[PDB]
Structure 1
Amino acid sequence: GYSDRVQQITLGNSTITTQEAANAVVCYAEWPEYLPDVDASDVNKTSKPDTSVCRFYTLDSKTWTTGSKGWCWKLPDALKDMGVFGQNMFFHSLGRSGYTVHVQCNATKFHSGCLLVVVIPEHQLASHEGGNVSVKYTFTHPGERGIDLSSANEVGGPVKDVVYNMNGTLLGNLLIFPHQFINLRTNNTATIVIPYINSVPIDSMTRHNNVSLMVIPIAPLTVPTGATPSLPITVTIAPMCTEFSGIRSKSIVPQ
């Protein structure tokens, strides 16, 4: 009586149940694991807070309306302030982590709409100015708020044009990245497990984000007659196999 459909994920002191899942994706078919010695470089023993950092943090909720263009969060940024995960983050020189991402959106059998939930490794954004204008730090570190693709261009911020993925590629091809759809008629959640993907064994958690999670409405939300025209979307994310190394004074970052 197991269905692909019902699932439970327990991680730390927190549990999620979905009764309307559509399997789960594990990026590149690899599950998060700690850093092996053969791959290690820094000689420091690392710190593995385990259950105090590897639990589920639910970010603040978004509201899908008929005019929504899509939202974008960066990792580990989105979690920069969650509990002890965040403290560890500002206090060590280097850290490394994988995540379980669970995006939630329920409706009824009269609604229609379909969101794309995708994880993009190394999502370098484009400046809407063109040329070689850079995208300032603050703009690519929105924190739990994430970036709202239907917000206005700002100065020093990225471009927010959806059919170009914020980088000069077409929305249609985002499907080459680990992703899952939430089609109100099928699905009510999306779950993706992200292994740590980098060109170095461990890195800085503040100067470099290693994935952007993106939720994009593709088939517009259509509510039943005289229904309220909107649904909330909630994102809950859990660091998994986290390791921190090179402890010290506590980083100070712009803004």
Structure 2
Amino acid sequence: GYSDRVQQITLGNSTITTQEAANAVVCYAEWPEYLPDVDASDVNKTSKPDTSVCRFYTLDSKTWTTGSKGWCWKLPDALKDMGVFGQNMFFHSLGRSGYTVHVQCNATKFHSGCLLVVVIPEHQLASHEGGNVSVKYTFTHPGERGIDLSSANEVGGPVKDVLYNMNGTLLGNLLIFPHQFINLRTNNTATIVIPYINSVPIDSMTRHNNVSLMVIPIAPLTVPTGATPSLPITVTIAPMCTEFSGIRSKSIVPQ
């Protein structure tokens, strides 16, 4: 009586149940694991807070309306302030982590709409100015708020044009990245497990984000007659196999 459909994920002191899942994706078919010695470089023993950092943090909720263009969060940024995960983050020189991402959106059998939930490794954004204008730090570190693709261009911020993925590629091809759809008629959640993907064994958690999670409405939300025209979307994310190394004074970052 197991269905692909019902699932339970327990991680730390927190549990999620979905009764309307559509399997789960594990990026590149690899599950998060700690850093092996053969791959290690820094000689420091690392710190593995385990259950105090590897639990589920639910970010603040978004509201899908007929005019929504899509939202974008960066990792580990989105979690920069969650509990002890965040403290560890500002206090060590280097850290490394994988995540379980669970995006939630329920409706009824009269609604229609379909969101794309995708994880993009190394999502370098484009400046809407063109040329070689850079995208300032603050703009690519929105924190739990994430970036709202239907917000206005700002100065020093990225471009927010959806048919171009914020980088000069077409929305249609985002499907080459680990992703899952939430089609109100099928699905009510999306779950993706992200292994740590980098060109170095461990890195800085503040100067470099290693994935952007993106939720994009593709088939517009259509509510039943005289229904309220909107649904909330909630994102809950859990660091998994986290390791921190090179402890010290506590980083100070712009803004």
Q: TM-score range by the shorter chain?
A: over 0.9
Aligned-partner Cα distance in 2 for 1:60–1:138: 19
After TM superposition, where is structure 1 displaced by more than 3 Å over at least 4 residues in a row?
none
Q: What's the secondary structure of 2:134's corresponding residue?
A: coil
Partner of 2:26: 26
Cα displacement (A) at 1:117 = 0.0
Cα deviation, 1:73-106, whole Å, max 9, x if unaligned, reads 0000000000000000000000000000000000
CA distance in 2, matches of 1:208, 1:112: 37
Q: Distance in 1 between matches of 2:142 and 2:203?
A: 20
Q: How many residues align?
A: 255
**Displacement after TM superposition at 1:24 (Å):** 0.0
- Helix, strand or coil at the partner of 2:115: strand
| Superposition RMSD in Å | 0.0
Alpha-carbon distance in structure 2 between the residues aligned to 1:163 and 1:77: 24
Deviations 1:132-173 (A, max 9, x none): 000000000000000000000000000000000000000000
In the TM superposition, residue 235 of structure 1 has moved relative to its aligned partner by: 0.0
Write the mapping of 1:183-202 to structure 2, written as runs, cut at 5 A.
183-202=183-202
1:146: which partner in 2? 146
Structure 2 unaligned residues grouped into runs of 5+: none
Please state if 1:115 is matched with 2:115.
yes
- For 1:5-154, list aligned pairs within 5 A: 5-154=5-154
The whole-number CA distance in structure 2 between the counterparts of 1:39 and 1:163 is: 38
What per-residue deviation string (whole Å, max 9, x for no partner) do you get for residues 47-85 of structure 1? 000000000000000000000000000000000000000
In the alignment, the residues of structure 2 paired with residue 235 and residue 149 of structure 1 have an alpha-carbon distance, to the nearest angstrom, of: 16
How far apart in 1 are the matches of 2:80 and 2:163? 29
Distance 2:113 2:182 in 1: 8
Alpha-carbon distance between aligned partners in 1 of 2:240 and 2:159, rounded to the nearest angstrom: 31
Q: What is the CA–CA distance in structure 1 between the aligned matches of 2:206 and 2:57, rounded to whole Å? A: 19
Unaligned runs of 5+ in 1: none
CA distance in 1, matches of 2:25, 2:203: 25
Identify the residue that residue 177 of structure 1 maps to in structure 2: 177
Report the secondary structure of 1:175's partner residue. helix
Q: Residue 199 of structure 1: CA displacement?
A: 0.0
Once the 2 structures are TM-superposed, how far is the Cα of residue 20 of structure 1 from its aligned partner? 0.0
Q: TM-score, normalised by structure 1?
A: 1.00
Q: What displacement does 1:208 show?
A: 0.0
Instruction: Specify the SS of the correspondent of 1:38.
Output: helix
Deviation at 1:252, TM superposition (A): 0.0
Secondary structure at the counterpart of residue 193 of structure 2: strand
Identity of aligned residues (%): 100
- Shift of residue 34 of structure 1? 0.0
Distance 2:17 2:38 in 1: 37
After superposition, where does 1:233-252 map in structure 2 within 5 Å? 233-252=233-252
SS of the residue 1:221 aligns to: strand
CA offsets, 1:188-211, max 9 Å, x none?
000000000000000000000000
Q: Distance in 1 between matches of 2:120 and 2:162?
A: 14
Deviation at 1:12, TM superposition (A): 0.0
CA distance in 2, matches of 1:230, 1:252: 39
What's the TM-score once normalised by structure 2's chain length? 1.00
SS in 1 for 2:197: coil
SS in structure 1 at match of 2:89: helix
